Point group: D2
Chain length 154, copies 4
């Protein structure tokens, strides 16, 4: 029985801490580009999704670590897609929060591996995908990415 007008997708996560503010890009039809920043953790994180064959700029999550290395991951959409996302969660001492944040991220597509970005220190996590696609990102962000999760769909 349908009780709401908003469609849904499987959602896994979040991995990371309770700090920062929650955000959810929602779901689309695929991923075209990922723009992030990294240093001793992951700072900025924004995505260019595919929306029915055309690019759609997702909401930005710039964080607040201007010193970080900026990176643009341009996927050969639609032939290239993520088959795994992994990383590390843990406290970043200098933040003085005592809460876990995303210290590192690695993106593996059917074509190549991007990363590891940030610092691989803390507790690892990984989401290998055998069938289906990540069609959206969600998480929490403050000065850095506190947590991350994914929307999945066939």
């Amino acid at each position: 029985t349908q009780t709401t007008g908003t469609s849904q997708t499987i959602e896994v996560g979040l991995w990371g801490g309770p700090g920062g503010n929650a955000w959810d890009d929602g779901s689309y039809t695929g991923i075209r580009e990922i723009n992030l920043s990294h240093g001793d953790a992951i700072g900025a994180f924004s995505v260019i999704y595919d929306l029915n064959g055309q690019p759609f700029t997702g909401p930005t999550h710039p964080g607040n670590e201007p010193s970080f290395k900026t990176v643009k991951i341009t996927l050969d959409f639609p032939n290239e897609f993520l088959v795994s996302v992994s990383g590390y969660t843990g406290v970043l001492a200098r933040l003085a929060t005592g809460k876990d944040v995303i210290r590192s991220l690695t993106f593996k597509t059917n074509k190549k591996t991007y990363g590891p970005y940030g610092k691989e220190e803390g507790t690892p996590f990984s989401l290998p995908i055998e069938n289906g696609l990540i069609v959206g990102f969600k998480g929490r962000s403050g000065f850095v990415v506190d947590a991350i999760g994914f929307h999945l769909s066939l």
Copy 2:
């Protein structure tokens, strides 16, 4: 195993004829507003979809019928959503094509019924929904709506 970067949704239809030119809005997360025109058939058909909580203007399919009455169904999204779409398919003599078109359309939500619009002549068709949502429209259009179909999702 995943072999493409484009996600998908269930698709039903089309109902109608082979005339006009094919179009497919793709899929989104919901429906906010439906714009259409009608007279002896359904002429224009355009939708304002929901895309993760924000409106997204779907591609237009105005057809070309100056005399048709225009209707703007503004749903109380997300509390109100379609639970059924029905109508009639059949030849419209004046088009001189001999091909079926969408003569009528009725939209029923969990709150009320909109229509019938057009003329209920020809062969009826209906898509009652018990679980899930219409998240996108597709079809064919010329001077009027030749055919219509739907993308469905939970």
Copy 3:
């Protein structure tokens, strides 16, 4: 957010009347065989589904009309599958109910068409499928099939 332990599928329908008693086979991974009976309407309707590569007999819905012609539709699973199901709904006078029942049914796969079975009288209905599969049947049955619906999945 997940609030129940039972998974779900999109469900379309029901087409037919409010008579009889409700039944729902639930969802599986495909359809292998359909056994029905027909005359001036569709009486019995029972399915053998596929469950992860192996046959699984669903609950029976024989109705209570013993005089109909019995038919067995054995699909070449998994290469052959339904791409459309259509039929007619309408009153059957000898039932003395004045409520619609399933008068006729037609099953079209990517290989061939089965039917029409029963009597093509009343109001037609059709469910053409472009993407996705019927993975379960539901409906209402009394003396004959009063209504029918489908569980859909990618």
Copy 4:
């Protein structure tokens, strides 16, 4: 466009190593009971699934560790369901293959946490779920569980 008669579900994993023999229970409508054994790792792993309101015993994966302690996790289906599965993957001294096996497993439902079972040594992994359900298990087994994966559905 549909090109096969078998439906599908999202599949995540595998977590663990390449040893043992691959197995896949397929997908169902939920989980009713989990039977496993553990010692210096996870040995046996068998599940009783829900299939449209009726239990369905999945194929067994007994492994081969007579000394392992057996555990039966009977969920209060459908009110109780897994919201997270986590564990550890790592080498076993007695295997001398340098390849990982599932050393530990922890099952968290919306009602309680079962485990940890086995030994929490090696590299941790976790699959927290925010929306959707695990409707099937897959993996690899020899004397113990080498790897594990999940079928997911809304």
